[PDB]
Design a protein around this ligand. Structure first.
Ligand SMILES: *Cc1c(COP(=O)(O)O)cnc(C)c1O
Ligand SMILES: *Cc1c(COP(=O)(O)O)cnc(C)c1O
Lengths: 448, 437
């Protein structure tokens, strides 16, 4: 009869058999015109001879043997898939991510294929826009965009681990989303995850995910400097890979959110993509994904972008208003490089201004993170300057689920935040247990 | 919205309310446009689709048509519920629907947990909670709010929607209402207010009433206000909701490339859910998409309701909360009901979380059930099993925090993983890592 599958399972590559044409390597970020320096992804590598960032470079020549149409159709034939690799919004674009990993080593939770919402009501009643979308990277297994990166990173690591290569585990020194996504993926695969922290930076609340995921969290008696000293001293005496902010392998998974944005728009290029970004790699990552789609010819243009920044966070904005003539190569260089290439813009949000944009977006039905506030603030501003027209297809990237920011909204709505009006707050309304009284609170609210 | 909009439609499809499990041959049917709530017996209602019209198209036609909507960003179609419109609210205009593209939820392979804890290789968790609101309720509210939107749009007296819930239904409800500009009203006793628990409705600009009484007298004012004004009270036991929800069963099949799982595990807090799944699978069977329907399991919290007692006694003592639905369902798919003590559900949670997950206590209740089923040998190690996760784990942190710090009264917390203290000394640190690795 209807053979569903063979009793036992565990689990189509765009390439010549018994000989995979694609490959990638580590190269220095935006290296010289004629440079040879490289590293295998199999090497545990963090900087480049000069102490500079690394960037994963894919063999563009291999990929190009196959035309634009080839790749749109290949990627499109994997939408809706339930198979070991293809499910993931990252692995479905494996060839352009980690072309050489065996599917047996991938560590996926089916990240990607992220909600691309249409802010009909917010666009209209607030910006006069009819084609504003929000890309919910936060609606994932972890609560953030960081799952795109960790899937790749943990895959690469699981690969080195299974090759009898030496990697006993993964280390980290973060109390946020990276630590959460990193501990998650590692746990699914059975790879130890170690978090290193000064004891004065422990918060059961902030570490709920790694703790829940089985991470070995060290609460160390020293400050951050002394904690970094140990990490460095440990990793050098134990093959433990540190997942660092600067890791370029995470960028290979994050770049898929851009490809996906194009995919979801049935390969049409948006006029503007706003990337929030306390973390400067997020925007380069998007740029890399949009650039790659174009290099390979899946589309003809790359979208203009916005690096929306929180007030006084970094000097990125100061640099932009003065056409970067005071710039010199938090990793700004990748942001700058990326904004140059796409003729981008950088814009700001005050602390009060992001909370208000959040209340406005939230009143429209969304339940967003501070960074989307910054993004939307950037948008409300760029709109007044006539830089973003009303009919302009704009996508705002949301990197973390709103459920991670409740305490922020609570404080706001109950007018409990210092230095801020909290003008759009909606606290509950007090009323006597009297019929008529209640009919009044109601009659007005609503109207007549 | 302006895209699919062309006149082509002389809409062959339709639906209406009929009493739940209607006696053989019944003229009793109300229009979905009406605001009804009980049948004539005082009994429940159900949304019956006209299986007649729907059958002029085969299984192949249905599997193909839905699959063509996957990955789509078209007006209603982006949605995991609207992609299945024809079987949800076939008569609503596209301009009426209120959607945030809910659905198309993650179907995760619990590879590690399955193998390491049960000896199962094809255990999947359907994360209905990873969404806009953080719960399964989006599925249901998109439909309710849509239908409410429609009645209203027809310059119809519907000044607002009301609720007397501090949970998920309310969060989902106020979200949909806000996107639509439909006032949402939460009525509550002053002693149940919590900025914490009402964070989402509040954020969503719902009009939250903090009334100076208790629950009973609060229920009274709602009765009073609703007879004077057309505020549609989001029935708990409301039937438009199940129409939205059934699509999660449909999605599960669509997800296995139209293949039927051997077991679906629904953590039955709200009994309508398990019945919603069955409705979804049985609809795919009748219409010829698949050929079987999965056996199911209603996972309960120990002592929740008489459901379990009714089950351990082959439903011999049962008479027709919304228990009947569950019964009717578990009978038709030769289902099972199973219990989870407070402790059991937490430990399971700690075991699933340890494998990469980060789940709500109901999935704790499902896995517990699964664990017992595997022992009794009822569920086989190679059975394609799907556990349904109804709420996002981020809404249950305090639970885990307390569990992982050994502070939950009358429970061991066998799997607490608290952070470990060590001095800032290299041997000291090397020692602890040595044993751990
Ligand atoms: C999120 C992110 C970081 C920072 O991680 P935290 O855990 O929030 O410190 C650094 N680099 C990249 C590329 C990131 O995405
Ligand atoms: C959630 C739900 C309800 C009621 O909401 P609460 O938050 O549980 O009060 C009623 N019926 C069904 C089917 C539900 O899923």
């Amino acid at each position: 009869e209807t053979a569903v599958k063979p009793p036992h399972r565990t689990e189509r590559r765009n390439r010549s058999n018994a000989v995979n044409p694609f490959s990638a390597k580590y190269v220095p970020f935006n290296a010289a015109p004629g440079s040879t320096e490289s590293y295998s992804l199999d090497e545990i590598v963090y900087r480049s001879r000069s102490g500079g960032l690394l960037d994963v470079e894919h063999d563009m020549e291999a990929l190009k043997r196959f035309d634009g149409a080839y790749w749109r159709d290949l990627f499109d034939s994997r939408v809706g898939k339930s198979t070991w690799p293809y499910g993931s919004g990252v692995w479905s674009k494996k060839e352009w991510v980690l072309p050489e990993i065996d599917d047996d080593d991938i560590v996926s939770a089916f990240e990607g294929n992220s909600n691309l919402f249409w802010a009909e009501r917010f666009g209209k009643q607030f910006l006069g826009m009819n084609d504003l979308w929000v890309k919910h990277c936060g609606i994932s297994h972890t609560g953030s965009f960081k799952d795109l990166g960790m899937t790749v990173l943990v895959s690469q690591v699981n690969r080195l681990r299974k090759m009898k290569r030496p990697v006993v585990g993964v280390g980290c020194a973060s109390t946020g989303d990276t630590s959460a996504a990193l501990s998650a993926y590692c746990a699914s695969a059975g790879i130890p995850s170690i978090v290193f922290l000064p004891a004065n930076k422990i918060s059961m609340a902030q570490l709920v995910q790694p703790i829940a995921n089985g991470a070995f969290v060290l609460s160390i008696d020293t400050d951050f400097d002394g904690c970094m000293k140990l990490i460095r001293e440990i990793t050098a005496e134990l093959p433990i890979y540190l997942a660092n902010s600067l890791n370029s392998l995470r960028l290979e998974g994050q770049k898929t959110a851009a490809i996906e944005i194009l995919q979801q728009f049935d390969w049409q290029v948006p006029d503007w993509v706003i990337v929030p970004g306390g973390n400067l790699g997020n925007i380069y990552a998007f740029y890399k994904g949009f650039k790659m789609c174009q290099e390979l010819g899946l589309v003809d243009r790359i979208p203009r972008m916005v690096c929306a920044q929180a007030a006084n966070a970094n000097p990125l904005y100061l640099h932009y208003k003065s056409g970067w003539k005071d710039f010199k190569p938090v990793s700004i260089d990748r942001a700058v490089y990326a904004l140059k290439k796409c003729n981008g813009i950088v814009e700001e949000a005050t602390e009060e201004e992001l909370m208000d944009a959040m209340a406005q977006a939230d009143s429209t039905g969304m339940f967003i993170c501070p960074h989307t506030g910054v993004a939307l603030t950037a948008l409300f501003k760029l709109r007044n300057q006539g830089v973003i027209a009303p009919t302009d297809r704009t996508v705002v990237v949301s990197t973390a689920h709103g459920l991670k920011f409740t305490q922020s909204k609570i404080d706001y709505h109950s007018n409990a935040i210092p230095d801020m009006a909290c003008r759009f707050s909606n606290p509950p309304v007090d009323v006597k247990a009297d019929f008529g009284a209640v009919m009044d609170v109601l009659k007005s609210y609503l109207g007549s």
